[PDB]
Amino acid sequence: SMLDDAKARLRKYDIGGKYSHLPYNKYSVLLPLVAKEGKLHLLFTVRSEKLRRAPGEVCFPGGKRDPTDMDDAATALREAQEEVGLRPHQVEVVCCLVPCLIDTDTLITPFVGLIDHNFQAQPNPAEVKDVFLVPLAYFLHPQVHDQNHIFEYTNPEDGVTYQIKGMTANLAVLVAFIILEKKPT
Ligand SMILES: C=CC(=O)N1CCC[C@@H]1c1cccc(CC(=O)Nc2cccc(Cl)c2)c1
């Protein structure tokens, strides 16, 4: 099936816990995959204008690990619940992709998660201004704008344009390559 094929592809890139004990300031992100209309989509948030770091920007759900988290996957799931109401039974964590190093002392670990078809986002307005889907295939032929390369995605439901950039854009491309490369039609 489409979903069984996605997970099998993703598993080949799972680094697991290889890098998880290293003594960094640790954050985790969830790359949430949603199946709609026969196709895979990624779910993105728009960060609240209130927030200190990067108000109003497109981001994946996630945040800083805390002492309650059993592991890095737990951080991602705790934060996704807080931000968009995603509950643990509504997500299967399929793998841990390549961690992102920033600022010399910070390590951000990305987890890809398959989201239940009945999940409906409840944006928490103190953290998240908006939630939207992008078809995964968009990231193979994005509308590129230079400001370094920025993606512009216009939701055909409502005509709203979102800008996706930086590691958010990078991770999205990675996931699209993993799952969609070399597929019969
Ligand atoms: C910054 C954009 C991005 O997607 N990436 C992936 C790698 C780098 C960066 C990131 C750094 C550190 C935490 C996070 C995840 C987070 O903080 N989400 C978030 C969303 C919406 C409300 C809130 Cl409160 C948080 C992400």
Structure description:
With 185 residues, this protein is an alpha+beta fold. The chain has one domain. The protein is 21% helix and 36% strand. It has 3 helices and 11 strands. Strands 1, 2, 3, 4, 5, 6, 7 and 8 form an 8-stranded mixed sheet that branches. Strands 9-10-11 form a 3-stranded antiparallel sheet. Strand 6 and strand 7 form a beta hairpin. Helix 1 crosses helix 3. The chain is globular. The two termini are 14 Å apart. The ligand C=CC(=O)N1CCC[C@@H]1c1cccc(CC(=O)Nc2cccc(Cl)c2)c1 binds next to strand 1, strand 2, strand 4 and helix 3.
Sheet/helix structural class = alpha+beta
Bound small-molecule species: the ligand C=CC(=O)N1CCC[C@@H]1c1cccc(CC(=O)Nc2cccc(Cl)c2)c1
Question: How many domains is the backbone divided into?
Answer: 1
Strand tally: 11
Q: From N to C, what is the helix and strand string? A: HEEEEHEEEEEEEH
End-to-end separation = 14 Å
Instruction: Please bin the fraction of helical residues.
Output: 10-25%
Strand proportion: 35-45%
Oligomeric status of the shown chains? Answer: monomer
Which radius of gyration do the C-alpha atoms yield?
16 Å
| General shape | globular
Q: Count helical runs.
A: 3
Report the major sheet.
8 strands, mixed
Domain Nudix hydrolase: 24-148
Keywords: Hydrolase, Magnesium, Manganese, Metal-binding, Peroxisome, RNA-binding
Motif (Nudix box): 64-85
EC number: 3.6.1.-, 3.6.1.77
